[PDB]
């Protein structure tokens, strides 16, 4: 309505919904029914599953933000509806980092991957990613509860600077951001550096242009979310600097959630067979 910090949040978040559901939904149909079982499809199925579940959950943020804090969606749902949110975002991050260790392993150990890389390993690793992403959700479910102020429901935290608060934030930055973004810059640097130096070198430029627009969408979608999660641990919320940070907090989540609408384009709809199956499916329906 007003305070364009909030106005921009609906704008960024809504276009995510409009461009997200058709995107991931199309990938699920093409990959899950039309194509065979390969290691590549396993990564793209789980990544779109985690993205779509994140995409379907955008309007709940719209409902929470439209009513300006009031939480009429119950008294138990201010314990689980954020835990569903956190699981889906942080399973994407660990799924992006497993498609960077898999591309680096193909270039680094090609003979080993030829003999031992199959669909069994792809499913086993994808299973452990969901389990790890589940553990990080536990601190949210335990400490979330419902406040009641001025007859308006408040979906706050019952901490007890709260020591458990610091532990949640730091483990969400070290794991989640620092670790996934070092494995992702180092794995896309070896690939570019190795496909330029050999006795059969080609001297092309496609690998460099793709390994820079992938580690730059990630580092611009998720970086404001982690910066605006530490300045809240060390700034008084009554100083005008402090509350101006809170107003712009909403767009930071909007950017992180916006990353779900780019994944079907940067990863799945980037090869050649998948795009060809996309036109054939689209032409057949039309």
């Amino acid at each position: 309505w007003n305070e364009p910090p909030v106005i921009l949040s609906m704008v960024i978040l809504s276009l995510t919904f409009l461009l997200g559901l058709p995107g991931n939904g199309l990938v699920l149909w093409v990959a899950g029914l039309k194509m065979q079982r390969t290691v590549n499809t396993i990564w793209f199925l789980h990544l779109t599953l985690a993205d779509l579940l994140c995409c379907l959950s955008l309007p709940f943020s719209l409902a929470h933000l439209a009513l300006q804090g009031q939480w009429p969606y119950g008294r138990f749902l201010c314990k689980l509806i954020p835990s569903i949110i956190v699981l889906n975002m942080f399973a994407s991050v660990f799924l992006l980092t497993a498609i960077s260790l898999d591309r680096c392993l193909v270039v680094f150990k090609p003979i080993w991957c030829q003999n031992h890389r199959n669909v069994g390993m792809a499913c086993s690793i994808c299973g452990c990613i969901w389990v790890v992403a589940f553990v990080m959700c536990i601190p949210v479910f335990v400490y979330r509860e419902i406040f009641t102020t001025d007859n308006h429901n408040r979906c706050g935290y019952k901490f007890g600077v709260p020591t458990p608060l610091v532990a949640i934030t730091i483990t969400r930055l070290v794991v989640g951001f620092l670790l996934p973004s070092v494995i992702m810059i180092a794995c896309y640097s070896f690939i570019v550096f190795r496909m330029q130096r050999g006795r059969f070198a080609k001297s092309q430029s496609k690998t460099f242009r793709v390994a820079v627009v992938v580690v730059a969408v990630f580092l611009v979608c998720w970086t404001p979310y982690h910066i605006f999660g530490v300045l809240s641990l060390l700034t008084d919320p009554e100083t005008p600097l402090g509350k101006t940070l809170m107003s712009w907090d909403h767009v930071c989540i909007a950017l992180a959630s916006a990353n779900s609408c780019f994944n079907p384009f940067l990863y799945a709809l980037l090869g050649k067979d998948f795009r060809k199956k996309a036109r054939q499916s689209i032409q057949g329906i039309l």
């Binding site: 949110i85 956190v86 102020t149 999660g229």
Partner: peptide
């Protein structure tokens, strides 16, 4: 008490 966002 808190006016946090959802995911946060």
């Amino acid at each position: 008490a808190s006016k946090l966002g959802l995911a946060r």
